[PDB]
Symmetry: D2
Subunit: 149 residues, 4 copies
Amino acid sequence: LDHTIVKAPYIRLISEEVGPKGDIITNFDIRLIQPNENAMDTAGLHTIEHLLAKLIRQRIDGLIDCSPFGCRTGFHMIMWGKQDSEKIAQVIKSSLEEIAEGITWEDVPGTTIESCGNYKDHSLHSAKEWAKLILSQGISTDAFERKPI
Amino acid sequence: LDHTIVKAPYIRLISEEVGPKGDIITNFDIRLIQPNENAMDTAGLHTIEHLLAKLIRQRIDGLIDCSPFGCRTGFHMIMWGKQDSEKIAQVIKSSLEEIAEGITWEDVPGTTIESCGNYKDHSLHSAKEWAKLILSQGISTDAFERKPI
Amino acid sequence: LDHTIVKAPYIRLISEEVGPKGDIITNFDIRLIQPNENAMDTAGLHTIEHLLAKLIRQRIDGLIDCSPFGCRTGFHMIMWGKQDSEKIAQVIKSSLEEIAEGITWEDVPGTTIESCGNYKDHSLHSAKEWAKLILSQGISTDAFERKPI
Amino acid sequence: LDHTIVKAPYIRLISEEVGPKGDIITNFDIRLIQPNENAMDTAGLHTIEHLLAKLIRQRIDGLIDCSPFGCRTGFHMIMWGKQDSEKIAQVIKSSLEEIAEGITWEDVPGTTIESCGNYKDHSLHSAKEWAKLILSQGISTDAFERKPI
Ligand SMILES: [Zn+2]
Ligand SMILES: [Zn+2]
Ligand SMILES: [Zn+2]
Ligand SMILES: [Zn+2]
């Protein structure tokens, strides 16, 4: 991927893989922030990871994992089956809208020393303001051209 | 998982997943740091993420993804097929040893503004030093008892 | 200073600088975290920095600045005039108790986009939890020998 | 200060304080990054803090302290004696030009486990790239109007 030509926020299919018995696994680039222009702080990124794990699964089947990028500009989404980015775009948009306006502290799973490996590094405040910032730019179903929604 | 009773560094099989056509996937908790005692800085975590993606693929097949935890105490690793924590521990130990000694700056893939979403946030110094710190503690095949390899 | 042999949390006087006309300025190392064993996440550190600035001024005059170390293990405190490392200890301890016990979000100053240069990177959750952790280890008045206030 | 309308990078005199014997201390806002649009990662910020400490002293007298902002968009600079925002801008510009081109790993002070409280969290690569990015935008002598030197 040439990171200098994409336009975030976008949803991008990274790859599809076929297992031996023929199951398909799709990998998605969920870019929340424009590469090299900004990066999410660890606390909000961490809280958004916990929330997205929950919210996505309420909205769609087949989620294997949703882990953040080391570069902190988004999330790697792994799913069973072919998926297509417009459905994924709507799942992410809807989830972000819930984080922006709906989630309270008690809806954030795993914020104790027993259930999380860095439980101090959380921030609902950061997650809500990031979600709002990301939503205000529109979620595009294409990475190279703006196609919001 | 009770993060208070584990002993890091460890490799722990999280789950095996069967897809619709019977294909097996395995998810691994690659725990490099004791939960809630410390956390990797973003720069070294990011460089390690890049190097692991390359080093793991050189040593084993069927890697689907290896993404850092939002808590910054390790990596979530996903593979095709049944795998068991013993061979994964070896692959991880061997990769960390190469980071610790062998690797130079030109061996780190994706450190340019075109190839990476946050290309400034890298540190080979950090990656090397973290690698050696983790190695010095030993990599266990069990999360609850020290069984180093 | 040899960071390997200090015992944190501690307060340490670093130096007294004398002005051109004889005013004295004192520098303090406020070490909240054991060097190289851990480090505070940016959001907690940022929130604590906002709170400390206000809370310290409620308790003592002559504060010139209280800035976070680049290493994220504590704060640099600059004060007008000669000052006692023991009274500094009480002022910090008293401040941490309030963050731990009696601070709400509305009591954190400068948490808006107009008033702070990274207003999303805040966490009262992190600040409160770190303050509790620090207080429970005790604040020493000496860097090399546990002398808790 | 209204952070929404400043135009970074800039140098801004925050305040002068007088001591009982008539000594002047000047405080500066060294804003390297546009508030709320981006933030320096900890490693780059940490390495720059170590370098700015020596580089500034080689160029001007009276430096009391140069500490990072908790918001990670710049540095707080404290000096003996009367200001000169234009002269301060020149020193900062000159120091950044040195970081971008003249500094090697061995030129960074405090990068061992004895001499630094988080010695793994350093990155010459990050410091150099940030220094280049900042210089490409120009250092203004006025926070509100671009007067780049
Ligand atoms: Zn967590
Ligand atoms: Zn990257
Ligand atoms: Zn702030
Ligand atoms: Zn340092």
